[model samples]
Target: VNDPAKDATPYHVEFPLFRSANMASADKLSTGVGFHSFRIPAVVRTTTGRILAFAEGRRHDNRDFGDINLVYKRTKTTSDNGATLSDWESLREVVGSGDGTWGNPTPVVDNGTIYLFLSWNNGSYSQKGGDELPDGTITKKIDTTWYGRRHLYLTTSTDDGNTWSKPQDLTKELTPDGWSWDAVGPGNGIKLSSGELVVPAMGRNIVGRGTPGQRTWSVQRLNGAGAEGTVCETPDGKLYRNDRPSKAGYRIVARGTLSDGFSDFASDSGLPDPACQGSVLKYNTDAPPRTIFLNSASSDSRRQMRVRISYDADAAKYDYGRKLADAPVSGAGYEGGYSSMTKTADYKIGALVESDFFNDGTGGGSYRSIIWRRFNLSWILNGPNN
Candidate 1:
């Protein structure tokens, strides 16, 4: 049943999966329905072999606050390992009925069900508080009451994301006490080989318990890490927490298990960052185990998008990966930030990478969109660095 294309040479293809007016063309796969921009991409390959791509549909502008909704698009079928642009269905809103912000569309697929963990706050209250306008103006201070605090919510889709269940607030249950600001995966989570599911958040891993789709959840606290976090199960059966730092520097890496708790966080010098979110995936457990990591491989900018392969889960130096800009199709000004990775059923790495159309000399208000890229191992190996 193995596909022969896995060994194919120099295979890579990318297109703007989510778009705004700047990149709007009739050929675009998914554009915001009632929104001006989209950001914080999270993608996963479901049990049915279809890919579900999630993002924060910013209603007014590209800013993080004010009237944001968690939205997504699903593949009609898994043709060409889901690499074709026409394979994706029309854009759909998972949950956006409220006038408030519904964001951080972190999803984990378990037992044929897609469990979407989200973050919510009043549309009037932002991460740093205050209502912001399109012109980068904050009219007032952020609300400090219970209504303004960020809360965690969970929604599930049993029919392969055809329809999502109503969101259930899990703030009191999953969020730890005294947490004023929290985020549950602006990326994908992991369903371990040992049965439990782990959804990474700002500073903790929300561990699932009991049944698959109907599982209960709890938090495993982590220290010295930033808001955007990602998790992966190692070949040795332990868990790895690779996260972003509060400032421009190396990526924070920690090791532990569900039962034993994570170790103290440490920065990985090999994974440079611009304080942006990155993604990690347990590609496989074969003889040559692969753990894939993707991010903007720069300490000062978010345009140097790169993907690396770690044969050993805890490898300190990932000198083996390649940058997305190195690809022939990635033109100038292709900015990458806050990405999610999933192994397509056809043995290709499918990534939902955030792209800013105006990162180059062409100036704009930095409206955000997402680019869907699919590539194989041989393509990464053919890189100039490799």
Candidate 2:
């Protein structure tokens, strides 16, 4: 009933799915328990057509470190083009409920099981060395110890995100020896045509071998990916990674197969990034292949959110795309920063994009929430750029 080919009219809809504890939102999906702000969104459409949206529940403040929990909401969809605000279920925790940082909710659907890769560290350790946060909170320096360095974790959901298995530490299996700082995706991963799962991590892609849920994980070192990495399988069946660059200008791109490894990572001048995390989706593998990308398309700012489509399987360039500003919205706020995209079963592009409350250019604001945006390909094609 909901086919992209049948419905080519420009259509777009967005709503705030996760509200910060400080915000006064009537449709707040978050429980507002132990969380002051929410950031680092990751989402995936399960095999059963269930949408699972996840974020980091910053307990104290909006800072990157300190007590944080992995929270998520699930929803079912009918044969409609998009889901409404009432369709989503209440929020629940994935792990790290007590005291620690459980961030970077990278998820991928394989068969009936959902594999969610995460990054964790002690609540005291921050990304940089010891420093005082804006809220007058002091953070310790991250070290090379087991508890000091950021660790990799894996959690599986068999019932389409209703329940999650306890996070199993995958730091030793995934990360190299003596590694200190690290990160997985703040977005979604892709399953290859050969049935292998690729989860983009910092400067590497974690490939899963053996079966789907019960697979062994290994790292495929990449040349040019940054901390907030995003990956997708091109129409040609090769793995393509378009990641945030450390230098905060252009996006870094790389292509290769699982068996042969990846080529050298290069910057794509077409994609302007402010060193922020972006999401990419292989929209369809059908006749007219489409690969969709969403990010803040400004080199010095994360406020200019844009979505682009690449008809070519290579996805090396996305000159034909539109900005979120061109789309109609019911709510108002800064609608960019760290986004995740997935193709819904109802034949639309569903994205969980981060939003902030203030314009104070301190990277993030005092409060942060995630917005759910659903739109059709026809809407993207009708952009000014197109």
Candidate 3:
């Protein structure tokens, strides 16, 4: 289990996972067979060494609240030779189907089991519509309180993608009542070196003046602080949670004992997120070790993505780093957004990013896809800052 790759290093390269994703969404409005477009990428490799790529398969349009199914693609593990295969399986839908919405594929591979989590809500609460119906649609409110709650569910697979068990309701066990809204993660969760599970959750709470335990589920903003979040264990054997900020300018970071309570939320100037989901990965665990944080890299927008390397326990300072993509002005490639990263067993880094193929680089009209890349510490250490 330790040092599976035998310390082999790979050279730098960027290979895309799904092509014309944004283009497909534009065409899928007419047909809803598979998906129109894909968004929110999360990835994990099974104990059998199969790479599973996950995302939100937007059935019709790009709206987050509409018909979204949890879809994924599987690839053979070929990184041992410092290179991975290009061949990928077709997109297949997972737990989500029919009128209900399946979201946030928080996957973790532990003890030969691929444990997956998702938040589900009925179609009555439109992504276009908030927790309650919008004013333009109805004169009086439709009372979505009962219909719009995002419940947490867990499912597992032992055969590594050949099959899966039905989603079990973990809401009552993991979450108590009084919190109307909830979400798990849109990316993969982390299993600690000590074998603990950290899924990185965020949601709203109607409970007031909450206790330290309940505050973890406080009523969040429209999108909330902990919404698009990630977590990893520190070199000191402590848990660190860094989440996307809703109002606070800097990203909200909390650190403390795993069994005890977490510190009060504070903004971290060290890690910047433009209200976009980023990734936290433990790169090296040796003495004088290191960790990596990948994000959009822009404070004003969600386009520029970068990888920051830190040697300390809490990642208070990032030393060597490089930009993965620059925010476009009127470009053809690299329309950036949310990104996820992992340190592969082959001693190389792997990331699944939201890349756009578009006309005007400005906004609205861009088509997006997943750009999967496998690079080494050499590339990030020697790569250009721009």
In terms of TM-score, the best-performing candidate is: 2
lDDT (0-100) at residue 178 of candidate 1?
A: 67
What is the C-alpha local distance difference test score of each model?
Answer: 0.80, 0.82, 0.64
Tens digits of per-residue lDDT for model 3 on 134-178?
A: 223321212235455667887777776656788887666565465
lDDT of 1: 0.80
Residue ranges of candidate 1 with Cα displaced over 4 Å: 1-7, 26-33, 78-80, 134-144, 328-333, 359-364
lDDT tens digits by residue: candidate 1, 75-179: 987444567778888778888866778999899999789999999987667776555566566634334457768899999999988999999999999887667
lDDT of 2 at 365: 50
TM-score of 1: 0.92
The true-structure Cα RMSD of candidate 2 reads: 2.9
Q: What CA RMSD would you report for each candidate?
A: 3.3, 2.9, 6.7
Query: Residue 107 in model 3: shift from native, Å?
Result: 0.8
Report, for all candidates in order, the number of backbone clashes.
1, 0, 5
Give the residue spans of candidate 2 off by over 4 A. Answer: 1-7, 26-34, 76-82, 133-137, 328-332, 359-365
Query: Ten-residue segment with the worst summed lDDT in candidate 3?
Result: 204-213
